[PDB]
Symmetry: C3
Subunit: 141 residues, 3 copies
Amino acid sequence: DQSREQMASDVANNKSSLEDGCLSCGRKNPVSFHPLFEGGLCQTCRDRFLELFYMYDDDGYQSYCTVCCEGRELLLCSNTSCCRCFCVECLEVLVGTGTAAEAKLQEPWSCYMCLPQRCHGVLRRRKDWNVRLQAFFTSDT
Amino acid sequence: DQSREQMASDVANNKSSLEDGCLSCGRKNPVSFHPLFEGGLCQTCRDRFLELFYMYDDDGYQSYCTVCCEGRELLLCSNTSCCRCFCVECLEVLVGTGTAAEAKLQEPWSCYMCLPQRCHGVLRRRKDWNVRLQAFFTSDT
Amino acid sequence: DQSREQMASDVANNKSSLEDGCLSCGRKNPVSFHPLFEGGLCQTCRDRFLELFYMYDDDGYQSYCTVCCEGRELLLCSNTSCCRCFCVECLEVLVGTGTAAEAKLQEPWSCYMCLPQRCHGVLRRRKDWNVRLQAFFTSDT
Ligand SMILES: [Br-]
Ligand SMILES: [Br-]
Ligand SMILES: [Br-]
Ligand SMILES: [Zn+2]
Ligand SMILES: [Zn+2]
Ligand SMILES: [Zn+2]
Ligand SMILES: [Zn+2]
Ligand SMILES: [Zn+2]
Ligand SMILES: [Zn+2]
Ligand SMILES: [Zn+2]
Ligand SMILES: [Zn+2]
Ligand SMILES: [Zn+2]
């Protein structure tokens, strides 16, 4: 089974497209797409987002990583219009080693949806993220 | 058992949080959140929005209250890019006594999603309403 | 009004409203609305969008016509923030004869969701398309 470290390395070296790996778990030939970041989304990782219990914590931050839906070791966007979260693992594997530690020291921290810069490592916000999100909500499938 | 009048009074006097009452019906400890306004949303009030038949009337205005999903005594946003509706009861209870009558005299009336001002009484548009609405559409539970 | 050619002609010459025909197939008295363009949407044409499997082709353009969901002869929006598609038939019948041929030679082509001009033939982008699309995603029926 393709690790996320292997997927990130192949993407950076133009061996695979982001679209042919699950951005969340690393597996090959996912059925669907992550709507916010360049990358596929497998059926299992897509169902995690749909099947969350509480989507927010008691402080009004999201209870889940925007990329992989993990709830542990979340970095919290300081933009009160956003309140999205990214996990340590996604920062380490998609942006690069040390990103998580650097981000935990930033005061305030702005997430990868809020940053003007579109790409960091193989974490690339979609140019068409808004239309992609509309497409993601359109399908029953 | 908790009335909406009791919930609004406790919120204004910092006795309870908007998030621990249903903004639509007043019930304590709702399961989810109203996506547009600060406030909880119970399972049954959430199901009203999901189970609407016709969402628009013959004049192109929404057939339901943005807060509680009621069809009776709707005020109609005059912004042709919006066409959302708010009922008399939600205005009276969340904004305050006389709001509906004051709104009927406005030349023209702009709804609480269109007004630059975020808060009126305990009706507070979310700073993160757009991300909250994306979270609301993501959930299949 | 039965064929799409008949519906377009009646609309242009003030015999019918766009809202009383299916924008996708031409059928009279459709149950719902097209969320992006003025026009009804019948149950069958609405179900095409809900039952899409792949929303995107291998080049990151949408796999379906924005208006009718079929097409096969898709024109591709050149805006990398959009990547929507419109079929030859929808352009010929809603905008007018020659539109498809003109659009295939245009370098680059901007689709009817991107163009500043709201109206071309009987194709009118909704003033409230964003709120209409939120209403479209709200219904679980
Ligand atoms: Br694999
Ligand atoms: Br949306
Ligand atoms: Br509940
Ligand atoms: Zn996955
Ligand atoms: Zn993550
Ligand atoms: Zn953010
Ligand atoms: Zn309720
Ligand atoms: Zn109401
Ligand atoms: Zn409004
Ligand atoms: Zn139809
Ligand atoms: Zn078409
Ligand atoms: Zn476009």
